[PDB]
Amino acid sequence: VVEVPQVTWEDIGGLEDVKRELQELVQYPVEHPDKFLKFGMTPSKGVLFYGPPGCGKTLLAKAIANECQANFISIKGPELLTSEANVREIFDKARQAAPCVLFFDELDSIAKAADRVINQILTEMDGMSTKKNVFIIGATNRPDIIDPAILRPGRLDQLIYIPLPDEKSRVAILKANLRKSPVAKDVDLEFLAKMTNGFSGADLTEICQRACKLAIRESIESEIRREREPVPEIRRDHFEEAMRFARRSVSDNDIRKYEMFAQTLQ
Numbered sequence: 227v228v229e230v231p232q233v234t235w236e237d238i239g240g241l242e243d244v245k246r247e248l249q250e251l252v253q254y255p256v257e258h259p260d261k262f263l264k265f266g267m268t269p270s271k272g273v274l275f276y277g278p279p280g281c282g283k284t285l286l287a288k289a290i291a292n293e294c295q296a297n298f299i300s301i302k303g304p305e306l307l308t309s310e311a312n313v314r315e316i317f318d319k320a321r322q323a324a325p326c327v328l329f330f331d332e333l334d335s336i337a338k339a340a341d342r343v344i345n346q347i348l349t350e351m352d353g354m355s356t357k358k359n360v361f362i363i364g365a366t367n368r369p370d371i372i373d374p375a376i377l378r379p380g381r382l383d384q385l386i387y388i389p390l391p392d393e394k395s396r397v398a399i400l401k402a403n404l405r406k407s408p409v410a411k412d413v414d415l416e417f418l419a420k421m422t423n424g425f426s427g428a429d430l431t432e433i434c435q436r437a438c439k440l441a442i443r444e445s446i447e448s449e450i451r452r453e454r455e456p457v458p459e460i461r462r463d464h465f466e467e468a469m470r471f472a473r474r475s476v477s478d479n480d481i482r483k484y485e486m487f488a489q490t491l492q
């Protein structure tokens with residue numbers, strides 16, 4: 227289905243630098259059109275996100291569309307395999323749905339015939355102007371096998387690193403996930419951030435989801451019993467129990483590889 231996503235910047239913990247860069251990348255064409263006319267700037271057509279899984283690349287693509295009040299179309303890389311006109315029809319539908327964000331997920335899978343489902347993608351991008359109001363976003367978990375042809379000017383304009391959350395970011399992710407939940411006052415999220423070094427954003431969300439379930443199942447059972455004869459909260463002890471099916475999903479070795487890739491691009 228095609229729709230404007232509900233996720234906002236507020237749902238995304240950390241990545242504050244990345245967020246104002248993306249805002250500037252899309253707010254500037256419509257907030258200062260006179261200066262965009264004055265100097266000859268063409269709006270950006272695309273970005274490529276990279277980093278470990280579960281750290282917010284999909285969330286950021288949906289928040290960009292929500293900011294622009296734009297439709298969102300998602301395509302996972304493995305599913306363009308049956309048929310090179312598959313690529314042509316997706317760009318048609320995105321153009322039909324303009325203004326629109328077109329998100330290519332799991333692009334590392336086609337980075338490994340398939341040789342130019344790629345060329346088709348590259349040609350569709352070259353043949354589409356910024357006047358069509360379609361903004362393209364790709365995401366990958368394997369930045370080592372990016373064909374640099376997709377980063378040439380006129381295609382995806384910027385490669386952007388989306389890293390594992392640091393300690394400050396882990397507090398923000400917990401707070402964003404819990405922003406509309408009733409959390410007991412004995413819950414110390416800064417201490418939970420201290421104890422989750424190396425956790426991804428998806429890893430943190432599971433802890434919150436397990437603690438919230440445990441609370442619901444407590445609420446269910448206690449009213450079942452009080453029947454035999456006041457909004458409840460997620461308490462510290464629900465979080466205590468959730469945290470021992472809690473472990474990192476990204477290895478220390480993959481973390482080293484991402485950090486090396488990113489640090490060498492300064």
Ligand SMILES: Nc1ncnc2c1ncn2[C@@H]1O[C@H](COP(=O)(O)OP(=O)(O)O)[C@@H](O)[C@H]1O
Pocket residue numbers: 237238239240241278279280281282283284285286365399402403426427428429431
């Ligand atoms: N920065 C973040 N802030 C808040 N939640 C996050 C963040 N990163 C990941 N999550 C949680 O993990 C889930 C997966 O994130 P996603 O953006 O799909 O990861 P990927 O980087 O693999 O695209 C999200 O739905 C959300 O619950």
Ligand SMILES: [NH3+]Cc1cc(-c2ccccc2)no1
Pocket residue numbers: 367368369370480483484487
């Ligand atoms: N097993 C997953 C995996 C990840 C990587 C990798 C390679 C380069 C940079 C970052 C990550 N190589 O393999």
Ligand code: NA
Pocket residue numbers: 277278279280366367
């Ligand atoms: Na990923």
